[PDB]
Design a protein around this ligand. Structure first.
Ligand SMILES: Nc1nc2c(ncn2[C@@H]2O[C@H](COP(=O)(O)OP(=O)(O)NP(=O)(O)O)[C@@H](O)[C@H]2O)c(=O)[nH]1
Ligand SMILES: Nc1nc2c(ncn2[C@@H]2O[C@H](COP(=O)(O)OP(=O)(O)NP(=O)(O)O)[C@@H](O)[C@H]2O)c(=O)[nH]1
Ligand SMILES: [Mg+2]
Ligand SMILES: [Mg+2]
Lengths: 166, 166
């Protein structure tokens, strides 16, 4: 079967594991346990296509930055995640984009920009600036909430659709 | 506010009204009452953007074919719908594509190909041939079921994302 190797990349604390655990185990994780690298495989049917989602949950911590070049080489699509209440994570999203581009030696890499934690009333990054950023990148912009499960299948499935049209 | 004029086009019986009524009124319609043309306006928040979805539900019946040129001129994005248990509706989807292209005088029009009724066990159109068709068109392919509400917000929201990046 078709396997899709989807990498979740993003600063420390933005909710990566929390988007992968909602999708994989339908539970929101309230705790914070920092990831080094975690792999999840799930057979799913997306748009009638039976397939296997191989998902890598990576680290936000700059200690682990070294390993970035190894998983960007093997990933076919990247969820680039920032938290709507954290402007630095939003700015950091460019440090991943550039790095992914550079180890994959291409400008068009399948990617989705994900503004997570959209359940938070106290937002510092507005939709508008993240849409203009996704518009500049040429990728879809999806708001998500790992806690309400809002926008979660949507993000990962739109990523699958970006890899399919590439 | 941002308004998006989304046109639902597709052969007779494929489930257009049924996708618009699930989205608009969260009810599946079991009855068949043939549309001539229906407009639905709803203020929605998509990816944190408050906006208004202006939706036109059109006719499948070739009697009404004349009116096609008027609404294709004003629509900004088109849901092109076929039923998975009806190969002729799938073939018909090219007669709409070509017509839309031609009154809008452009090849890239925001559009999503939607294979509806995916709840049906007795499928005649396989994912694979509809994905290769969406892949040839350069548009996303979404399977939906107006009866289970599967893939319905996804289709209309991916259409909104196609209009936004255009
Ligand atoms: N309110 C809210 N909290 C969230 C959301 N997603 C994640 N969180 C919270 O954010 C904290 C960190 O989440 P986590 O998923 O570990 O983020 P991470 O990006 O994987 N951290 P790391 O880089 O170290 O691996 C946790 O307390 C978690 O519950 C969300 O949508 N909303
Ligand atoms: N099982 C199933 N039936 C569906 C689905 N969507 C619509 N239908 C059924 O298909 C029939 C026609 O649906 P309708 O929504 O009127 O299609 P239409 O494309 O709008 N017809 P028209 O071109 O004349 O306006 C109805 O009996 C309806 O309940 C679906 O996902 N699954
Ligand atoms: Mg993590
Ligand atoms: Mg109709």
């Amino acid at each position: 079967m078709t396997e899709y190797k989807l990498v979740v990349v993003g600063a420390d604390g933005v909710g990566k594991s929390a988007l992968t655990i909602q999708l994989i185990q339908n539970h929101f994780v309230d705790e914070y346990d920092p990831t080094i690298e975690d792999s999840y495989r799930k057979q799913v049917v997306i748009d009638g296509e039976t397939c296997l989602l191989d998902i890598l949950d990576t680290a936000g911590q700059e200690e682990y930055s070294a390993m970035r070049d190894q998983y960007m080489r093997t990933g076919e699509g990247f969820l680039c995640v920032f938290a709507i209440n954290n402007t630095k994570s939003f700015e950091d999203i460019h440090q991943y984009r550039e790095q992914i581009k550079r180890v994959k030696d291409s400008d068009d890499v399948p990617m989705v920009l994900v503004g997570n934690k959209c359940d938070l009333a106290a937002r510092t990054v507005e939709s508008r600036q993240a849409q203009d950023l996704a518009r500049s990148y040429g990728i879809p912009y999806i708001e998500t909430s790992a806690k309400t499960r809002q926008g979660v299948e949507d993000a990962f499935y739109t990523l699958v659709r970006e890899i399919r049209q590439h």
